[PDB]
């Protein structure tokens, strides 16, 4: 599949609401996510699924420098 | 008669955005008269290097260049909003008057 990583998430931002940030290029068929071990709250780094590598770049570009919880969002190829 | 005025401190970003703006206006074929290169103003401040004035009196010379250009075109004045949306590269800033 298309694999690339996203970072700088928030605690009040949940996975079903985080799907609508990258849904403009494709809708993710899964949500796999790290969460912490003391609190079981969001570890805030994860691997989101797109289907094709053309979707892997065009999702990534607009999401890069997009405003999420007053931050400049982060993506890298993985 | 709308004249877009570009100003920067570096020549290369200003040259790219002026080339991109005249390419976007030559693809739609309005009347565009070319870039008019106004003379560069060097802000020079020549200070002394030493903070207490003890040494062999060596002097320090700073400068900064301001590169000042414009493009002038005759068009409807609300067609002109659609060209200045590609020009948002840092450095260069855009001042528009009629």
């Amino acid at each position: 599949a298309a694999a690339a990583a996203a970072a700088a998430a928030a605690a009040a931002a949940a996975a079903a609401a985080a799907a609508a940030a990258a849904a403009a290029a494709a809708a993710a068929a899964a949500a796999a996510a790290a969460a912490a071990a003391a609190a079981a709250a969001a570890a805030a780094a994860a691997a989101a699924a797109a289907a094709a590598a053309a979707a892997a770049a065009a999702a990534a570009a607009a999401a890069a420098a997009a405003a999420a919880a007053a931050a400049a969002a982060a993506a890298a190829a993985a | 008669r709308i004249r877009i005025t570009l100003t920067s401190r570096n020549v290369k970003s200003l040259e790219k955005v002026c080339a991109d703006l005249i390419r976007g206006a030559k693809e739609k074929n309005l009347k565009v008269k070319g870039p008019v290169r106004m003379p560069t103003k060097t802000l020079r401040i020549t200070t002394r290097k030493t903070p207490c004035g003890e040494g062999s009196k060596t002097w320090d010379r700073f400068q900064m260049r301001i590169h000042k250009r414009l493009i002038d075109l005759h068009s409807p004045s609300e067609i002109v909003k659609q060209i200045t949306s590609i020009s948002i590269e840092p450095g260069v800033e855009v001042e528009v008057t009629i």
Binding site: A10, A11, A65, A70, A71, A72 | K41, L43, I88
Partner: protein, 224 residues
């Protein structure tokens, strides 16, 4: 209204005071520099930091606080500023972030030499070509001196010290004085511009290899 020259100078003073204030608050955040981008719907201020989770505070309290204090101090209007945090890719190739890290190790206290060798080892393991760290001041006893920690190669003069060399000077306040910490890092080449500079060094003569072609040794044609 106001000149072009006084506009450029006063915006430069805005960059200077914004980077100085953001260094003086944000030691813990991994602060390396700021990025201004101004469009008249909203004027955008982008902070470079390696750890965003101390930039936000409590659920984003200090980044909206930072939006509020930049709105209050510089005379900014109601609702033209919003504040972002950009993730820097390499901490080991930014001298400001590593200068803060050595400052935080030595201020939280360590041997000076094992601190500096951990910094030099991490910089040479991150993919730079070289480094130099001088920690000078009241190192050993009450007489001050220079201690230099180098590894790899360094360029020192000419125009290529302006785009191949990253430098930083920081202060650390100890109980018996101040000590001065300099980190100079040379960047690696990286010809596309991925993590390094686009143009090569101007003394570095690269020769493309010749193609391995065998001679025909007969006159012979080919159609189409």
């Amino acid at each position: 209204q106001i000149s072009k020259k006084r506009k450029f100078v006063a915006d430069g003073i805005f960059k200077a005071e914004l980077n100085e204030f953001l260094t003086r608050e944000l030691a813990e955040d991994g602060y390396s520099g700021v990025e201004v981008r101004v469009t008249p719907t909203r004027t955008e201020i982008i902070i470079l930091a390696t750890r965003t989770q101390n930039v936000l505070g409590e659920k984003g309290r200090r980044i909206r606080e930072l939006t509020a204090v930049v709105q209050k101090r510089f005379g900014f209007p109601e609702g033209s500023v919003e504040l972002y945090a950009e993730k820097v890719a390499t901490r080991g190739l930014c001298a400001i972030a590593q200068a803060e890290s050595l400052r935080y190790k030595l201020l939280g206290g360590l041997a000076v030499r094992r601190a500096c060798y951990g910094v030099l080892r991490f910089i040479m393991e991150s993919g730079a070509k070289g480094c130099e760290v001088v920690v000078s001041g009241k190192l050993r006893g009450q007489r001050a001196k220079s201690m230099k920690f180098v590894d790899g190669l360094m360029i020192h003069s000419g125009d290529p010290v302006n785009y191949y060399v990253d430098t930083a000077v920081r202060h650390v306040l100890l109980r018996q004085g101040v000590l001065g910490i300099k980190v100079k890092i040379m960047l690696p080449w990286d010809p596309t511009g991925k993590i390094g500079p686009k143009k090569p060094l101007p003394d570095h003569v690269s020769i493309v290899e010749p193609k391995d072609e065998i001679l025909p040794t007969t006159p012979i044609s080919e159609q189409k």
